Target: Non-structural protein 11
Amino acid sequence: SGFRKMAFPSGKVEGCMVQVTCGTTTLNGLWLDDVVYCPRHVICTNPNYEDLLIRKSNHNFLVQAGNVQLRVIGHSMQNCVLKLKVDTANPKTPKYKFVRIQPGQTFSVLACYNGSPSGVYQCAMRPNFTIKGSFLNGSCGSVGFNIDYDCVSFCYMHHMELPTGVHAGTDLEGNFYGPFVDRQTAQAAGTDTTITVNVLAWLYAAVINGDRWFLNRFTTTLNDFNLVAMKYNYEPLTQDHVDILGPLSAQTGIAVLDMCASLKELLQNGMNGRTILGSALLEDEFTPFDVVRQC
Amino acid sequence: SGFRKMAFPSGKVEGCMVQVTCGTTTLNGLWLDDVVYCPRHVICTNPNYEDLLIRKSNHNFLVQAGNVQLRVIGHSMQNCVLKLKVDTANPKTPKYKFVRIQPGQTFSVLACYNGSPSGVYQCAMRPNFTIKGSFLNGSCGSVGFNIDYDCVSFCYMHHMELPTGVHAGTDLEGNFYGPFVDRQTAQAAGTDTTITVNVLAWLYAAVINGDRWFLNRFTTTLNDFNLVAMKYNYEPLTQDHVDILGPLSAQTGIAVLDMCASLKELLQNGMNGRTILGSALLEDEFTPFDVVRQC
Ligand SMILES: *C(=O)c1ccc(OCc2ccccc2)cc1F
Ligand SMILES: *C(=O)c1ccc(OCc2ccccc2)cc1F
Ligand SMILES: [Br-]
Ligand SMILES: [Mg+2]
Ligand SMILES: [Mg+2]
Model:
């Protein structure tokens, strides 16, 4: 029993983190096989990164894997990341993939400074393509990931913090999540919404854990629910979301539309001072998979 | 910016987790140098563990470090843990200590099943010596730890789940946290209280992150505050707690007793639908050190 914000074990990723310095700029890099990936921000001083990279030599890049220096033998830019070929393949390279996630999905973040991992925590990609992370100066290049069996699916590299305190980054192919750019502008996060399918998954988690006070005998229609969800700034719930919640509906014996009626009531009346799984608000950063994995 | 429940990187501990089987009972063990530590529960079938262990041979213990079997060459019981001497020292042994923590302190938990790490999350030792963990069948032997520089301070080994869904375990010397025993009784968690110094540290974290709506011009006395804290089931705040909060008080320019007046108001009036650091309730599982580490 119990339900916590649970991250994946970070060992396999810790073995891949390195430090990258170019000029007076230092940040984190990801060392997989004979390639080090890092944000192209490291060559900064409306910049034109194509020019900046042409004006650079392999010897301008100091790559340090702990107490060992790696020799850069080739550099190239892939969108907003840099690929630095090095003369040494990482002996700790796990089986891995580069995957881009969808809004509503979760991933574990290994916050790193000067190539040294500092902490690990769970994050969700918000509907507005930001993440509510925890990052200080020097965290550029920290990566987010999931694990399936033995394979590390990298999905996020950290770049910048937006004015509202939220964070923006790219996939490992260097393509930004959301309408953000790696330069100094007035860019701000767009209006966010609540991830409805996740709130429902979390309600199932509560039931599985013996928290049932919010349940009711009623059942609603998918239409009538979405009419209420939109009013409260919730994402629309689709039939695919219902099918995805299938396994949890079976384990608990509560039909999805039955749970949706409980959610509707919670939106319209609040919690009346009660809590669900130790929370006084509806949590939406647990996916259906996250619940099954932990329950 | 940002504030998350952040665990320590688990790599150094992942390399120490093994599987231990005796009879049809399998659970997790901690392999450090040439010793494997695990709960004495593994020799179970008001048991008398001294008898049970006398009736066992080194060959009755199957220890598997991944795909490699370890040969047990000696066994002994230290309170509620077992020490299984093996013919092979763990080459991945980090610098480590066995430390017992105080109620109110936090630690990272690496939940493990069949010797395989599954997830990592942050926990606090409650005033009643339970932890609100996330553990399923097979999690016996999962460990909690902190990291200081390169040294892993192990502080918890998981044993059992209590009726209310909370968890009880021991330090690595086999001594239980709280008045719990490793046998089947009606034992239940005692009444819990809120960790006041932690709530204050978390309020400082909010201020450091730009959440200031709860602040007020007032300041209270340590006496007058504790009179209110006791009413709301909060731990007493001591002058040592005030001194510990010193660094955060300096960084923010808010005297501790000034923050205590904000806390008093929050207890007496609630949050009026607002949130602090994304929470609608007063969070008490962040220590002052946790805040400094992350802010
Ligand atoms: C770190 O990797 C990183 C990446 C992108 C950033 O974008 C904002 C910015 C501001 C000023 C100059 C260039 C880019 C910031 C970072 F820290
Ligand atoms: C796992 O390691 C473990 C340890 C102690 C436990 O105590 C409860 C109990 C119940 C029945 C027989 C013996 C002990 C339970 C565990 F799972
Ligand atoms: Br909350
Ligand atoms: Mg219902
Ligand atoms: Mg005040």
Observations:
- The longest strand of chain A covers residues 151-161.
